[PDB]
Amino acid sequence: FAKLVRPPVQIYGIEGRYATALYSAASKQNKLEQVEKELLRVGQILKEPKMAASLLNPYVKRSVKVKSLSDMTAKEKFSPLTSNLINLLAENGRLTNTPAVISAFSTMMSVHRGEVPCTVTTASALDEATLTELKTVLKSFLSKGQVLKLEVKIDPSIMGGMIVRIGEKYVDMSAKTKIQKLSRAMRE
Template identity: 45%
Template sequence: MASFRFAAAAVRQFSTSAARNGEIVQAPIQVFGIEGRYAHALYSAAVKQKKLDAVDKDMQTVQKLIKSDTKFAEFLHSPLLKRSAKTESLSALLKKQGFTDISVNFFETLGENGRLAETTGIVEAFLKITSAEKGEVMCKVTTAQKLDDRQLKDVKAALQMFLTKNQVLNLELQVDPELIGGMTVSIGDKHVDMSMATKYKMYSDLVKETLA
């Protein structure tokens, strides 16, 4: 109950009209922690104002900015800037980018509460909720080298076997040369490590134990 009261307060802070009745719209999945509380508050406000798709697009844009723009990410985490100046600068940037009022107000609330450094986690939590809303299943595949078209097709076909009829695969691809070969796969709450690096370590540990 405490987490929902916290979320309701957050909703009222950045969207008075969305919290007139003081109720929180239940999300399709629960995300916990501080990030989850803010994410649920934003989801509830967006649904009440019928702007979920637009806010979802805003949060995807923020996520891309954090990953592609080092200066933007550093700005969010910087403890050197005054809270008010940081909030005003971010608000102006988002308005210039055409963000919805609800998204702008939300980030202003994060700034006022000193939570901008936690933007990455909050945005990821929100996108998990909207992904579930759309029937998507998040999947992250990490390989030592970039997959070619045929390999990617085979991987997608294999992953489809884990989905039900109404689910949609939301695939994220990453490259990590330290895997040496093979891949790691995280889909839903499942994780499989098929990397050569892990196999080498397992064999190395086995040899050490045998010779000890």
């Protein structure tokens, strides 16, 4: 068999297998950026009410699905990789879970260019000065080449403090867990 080039991040499931196949196809020929473009364009195309309703009916012959998808991939002059991918999905019958596929690819592309995702949780909004110093400190966690991809969020449950997720690392500065730890210590 061929030596498919391993994508940076590994995904699993049918979505992950299709995404890995597409990533290794595009990586050879160095067509990642454009391929992502056509993928995020079929993302909009497939949401079209007519196509969305037509592709979920199981009572239209599969060949009809493939013919319609070839029609809708020739009009946009999609790269041969994306047209082949969509024909493949229609043949195998997995296009019902295309959004999981393309989404996975997006993830598999972020990890390529270093967008190590993060996530900050707090009980209130954050002042842009405080948020900016936060970003500046969080940047110190990464390596060279990587760039932070922050994502603010709000939860009321945690009283104060803060919660930070940096890829896999996780620091719970929240006051909820501090209170719980103190309560356990002063019970046990």
